Amino acid sequence: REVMANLTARVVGAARRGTLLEKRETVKSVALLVVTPDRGLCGSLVAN
Amino acid sequence: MEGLNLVATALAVGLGAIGPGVGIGIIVSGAVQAIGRNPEIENRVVTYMFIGIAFTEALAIFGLVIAFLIGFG
């Protein structure tokens, strides 16, 4: 995180601001990574 | 003989072309690369580039002036 903070503070206004750092406007598709337990008996955690 | 002044002026202008020409070429290449690397500071480096040019061409100008003196008196 510290190295990434230094690198992001270094680069400003680049060509489409990198690739993974690109603030791509007109958002049309969002992918979600949800992490859940493999087994039950957790309580309200999986439901929450 | 007779063409010594002409040879002198030609050599002076040619040397003031070979030196300052490569100098301003290096100046422009370095400034363009620096601008491509950092467009935010461009103004400053551009001014510095111009200052360098305003020096280098000046030397060539001096040579041309000297040649013109040899051409005239």
Side-chain angles (χ1 to χ4, degrees):
Chain A
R1 184 252 184 196
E2 190 178 3
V3 169
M4 201 70 228
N6 297 327
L7 187 45
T8 49
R10 177 63 60 195
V11 57
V12 293
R16 75 189 180 276
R17 292 199 59 83
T19 54
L20 287 83
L21 195 145
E22 173 181 1
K23 179 61 183 75
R24 199 182 304 163
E25 217 71 22
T26 72
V27 175
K28 64 95 175 179
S29 164
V30 183
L32 176 66
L33 267 71
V34 64
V35 59
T36 50
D38 270 318
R39 304 182 285 101
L41 301 180
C42 312
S44 298
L45 185 77
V46 187
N48 280 7
Chain B
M1 284 71 76
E2 44 188 0
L4 294 187
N5 47 359
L6 322 171
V7 165
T9 51
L11 284 177
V13 175
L15 298 197
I18 66 173
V22 181
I24 65 191
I26 294 166
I27 280 171
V28 168
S29 166
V32 160
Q33 195 176 5
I35 286 158
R37 278 210 209 103
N38 206 325
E40 281 82 39
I41 204 68
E42 157 175 292
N43 274 349
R44 284 276 98 177
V45 301
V46 161
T47 52
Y48 284 127
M49 168 196 70
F50 271 126
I51 282 171
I53 283 169
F55 281 138
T56 318
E57 189 51 54
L59 294 166
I61 285 297
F62 290 147
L64 199 64
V65 169
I66 285 283
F68 272 121
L69 274 177
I70 298 154
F72 288 162

